[PDB]
Ligand binder design. Structure first.
Ligand SMILES: C[As](C)(=O)[O-]
Length: 646
């Protein structure tokens, strides 16, 4: 009966009273595995800070009959479900958290939090009277992620936010069980990682004079300098902070496009280096792919990135190389292509990509990039198609194009993360990508044969920050759609349930409030038409039926037990809404229940749901829903009447 996001894989509920943590509760580890013992450490720290309860770490053994304890077990039975899987068994006897790997224990604790009162997150107030119940009944949860790659990307190149903000984001990701922080740290307007060998990357590339505002080509600027970067010490700190919360950081060093800041720092890197770090978001500089100094410089940068980022994957971008504006007609390019037998500029980038792929593999890492690296024309910049094949080991993040191109790459052996930008770009508005569209996202590309599904490792949702300058606006854009993507990445496809997710989002938004996340507040539509796809329809209204105020719909077959039934009068189309006065339930020819409140069902839906109390059914009787409504200012109105049971 709890509201964890993401919805877990398997839950079984039992009757009775729930487990409750009290001042007498203990945290007991029935294993001496150091990784499990560590998770007990921060679980204790985290739980006690939130609840105010002592929760002492006590030796494997005697718990008190006075209070349920938390018992941590290492159980290999969930090994086949992967290193993030866990189990929870909760009753007044005890709260058992089990996992094959220590990482599952951390996720078990995040689930535990979401089954307790949201006041847990409150930084103030007296909590000594809170009842720290674990949900409302005993239960057993077995949980594991559907996808191994559940990523959130934060663009700090366009606007820098810094350590405090990124850790607040990491906190949200952890609570939602998202496990990849994709860190977009370089681009045309900013370079945010200090490189010791090349100090100008930050001394120059991390500064710009002003920022375009509003939108692309707005003609508006803020006239305010913007600067900032991370030191290697700060990165090491954030890496550890995120890793303790089950998150691997994937750094992105943009190349060969999106490279203005790097070029202004060291102008030999580009054949068309700008005069200063761009102040608008429409300048896209490309590295020089024909020069040896380019690859040597980039390899040096990746050495220092390798040293401070432990993750196996290094993202090198590759998107949106403006071939026609950067390389076409340049003598270095044209001679290099003739010298190498290349017929198109996509051959140039493919040569760059495959050389960067080997440089990355020699450092013990694996490259990832946006799907332009696959070598097909994605943006229509005169690039053509690449004749040589992309390195099979390269990971592709698919953001743009017909998904048959993604499936081609998969069938060529590539692992693929689905980031189709018409669903996953959180910088877009809520009209462009509604909450419902984020939740409806399916990372497995349609029409991909089952034998290839294991190549789809997961998804990533992107917070690009051209138009985001404060943490509060970052939250407005990222949340709550990031909550939907967390569920897409974790919950089994067959357990997804958008109306249930919307209800759960209400409690989760209390946590976001107490945690300081300024999420968008009027974006959850209380009623979406798709919510009723599997709900009995008992009638319609048309212009013809709007000649009368009273309307009767048979529900005799649907009244099978006592209890509440919700009637929804849901506008479909037409110039006019209906105005609803009351809805009633009749047994035979006599009223047995009425909900009289004013409703209006049109483009806007105001109180269109009516609750009827059915008696235990009388055998042999009929039941009829009678609804009083009329056209609002006219009779051009079409709608559907739905009848829901408990
Ligand atoms: C053009 As973009 C994906 O860097 O906002």
């Amino acid at each position: 009966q709890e509201q964890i996001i993401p919805k877990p894989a398997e839950i079984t509920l039992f009757t009775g009273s729930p487990a409750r943590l009290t001042p007498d509760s203990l945290i007991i580890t029935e294993t001496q595995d150091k990784a499990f013992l560590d998770q007990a450490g921060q679980l204790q720290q985290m739980l006690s800070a939130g609840t105010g309860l002592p929760l002492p770490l006590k030796p494997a053994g005697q718990a008190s009959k006075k209070a349920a304890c938390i018992v941590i077990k290492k159980d290999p039975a969930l090994a086949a479900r992967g290193e993030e899987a866990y189990s929870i068994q909760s009753s007044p006897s005890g709260i058992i958290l089990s996992a094959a790997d220590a990482r599952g224990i951390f996720y078990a604790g995040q689930s535990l939090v979401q089954m307790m009162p949201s006041v847990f997150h409150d930084r103030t107030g007296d909590k000594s009277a809170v009842r720290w119940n674990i949900s409302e009944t005993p239960f057993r949860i077995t949980d594991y992620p559907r996808f191994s790659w559940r990523a959130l990307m934060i663009d700090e190149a366009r606007h820098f936010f810094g350590e405090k903000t990124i850790k607040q984001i990491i906190d949200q990701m952890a609570l939602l069980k998202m496990n990849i922080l994709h860190w977009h740290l370089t681009d045309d307007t900013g370079w945010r990682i200090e490189i010791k060998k090349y100090p100008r990357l930050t001394s120059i590339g991390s500064k710009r004079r002003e920022s375009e505002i509003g939108t692309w080509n707005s003609g508006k600027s803020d006239g305010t300098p913007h600067e900032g970067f991370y030191t290697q010490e700060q990165i090491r700190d954030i890496v550890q902070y995120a890793a303790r919360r089950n998150i691997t950081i994937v750094p992105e060093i943009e190349m060969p496009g999106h490279a203005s800041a790097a070029a202004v720092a060291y102008p030999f890197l580009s054949l068309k280096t700008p005069g200063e770090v761009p102040t608008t978001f429409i300048v896209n500089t490309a590295f020089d792919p024909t020069s040896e100094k380019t690859y040597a410089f980039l390899s040096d940068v990746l050495d220092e990135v390798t040293a401070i980022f432990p993750g196996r994957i290094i993202h090198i971008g590759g998107d949106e190389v403006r071939y026609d504006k950067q390389w076409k007609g340049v003598p270095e390019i044209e001679e290099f292509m003739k010298k190498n037998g290349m017929k198109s500029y996509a051959d140039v980038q493919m040569h760059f990509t495959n050389r960067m792929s080997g440089i990355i593999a020699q450092k013990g890492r694996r490259m990832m990039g946006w799907n332009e690296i696959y070598g097909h024309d994605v943006n229509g910049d005169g690039g053509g198609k690449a004749g040589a094949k992309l390195d099979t080991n390269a990971v592709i993040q698919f953001w743009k194009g017909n998904t048959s191109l993604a499936k081609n790459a998969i069938r060529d052996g590539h692992d693929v993360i689905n980031s189709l930008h018409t669903s996953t770009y959180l910088d877009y508005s809520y009209g462009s990508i509604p909450l419902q569209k984020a939740y409806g996202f399916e990372p497995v590309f349609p029409g991909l044969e089952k034998q290839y599904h294991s190549r789809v490792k997961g998804l990533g949702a992107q917070v690009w920050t051209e138009w985001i300058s404060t943490p509060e606006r970052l939250h407005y854009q990222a949340f709550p759609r990031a909550c939907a993507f967390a569920e897409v990445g974790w919950t089994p496809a067959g357990k997804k349930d958008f109306p249930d997710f919307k209800k759960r989002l209400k409690a989760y938004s209390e946590r976001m409030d107490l945690m300081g996340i300024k999420f968008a507040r009027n974006v959850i539509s209380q009623i979406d038409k798709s919510d009723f796809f599997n709900t009995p329809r008992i009638g319609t209204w048309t212009p013809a039926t709007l000649t009368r105020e009273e309307h009767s719909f048979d529900v005799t077959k649907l009244v099978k037990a006592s209890g509440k039934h919700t009637v929804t009068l849901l506008y479909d189309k037409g110039a006019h809404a209906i105005e609803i006065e009351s809805v009633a339930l009749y047994e035979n020819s006599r009223e047995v229940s009425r909900d009289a409140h004013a409703g209006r069902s049109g483009a806007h839906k105001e109180n269109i749901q009516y609750i009827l109390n059915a008696p235990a059914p009388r055998q042999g009787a009929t039941y009829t829903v009678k609804a009083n409504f009329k056209g609002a200012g006219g009779r051009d109105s079409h709608g559907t009447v739905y009848f829901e049971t408990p």
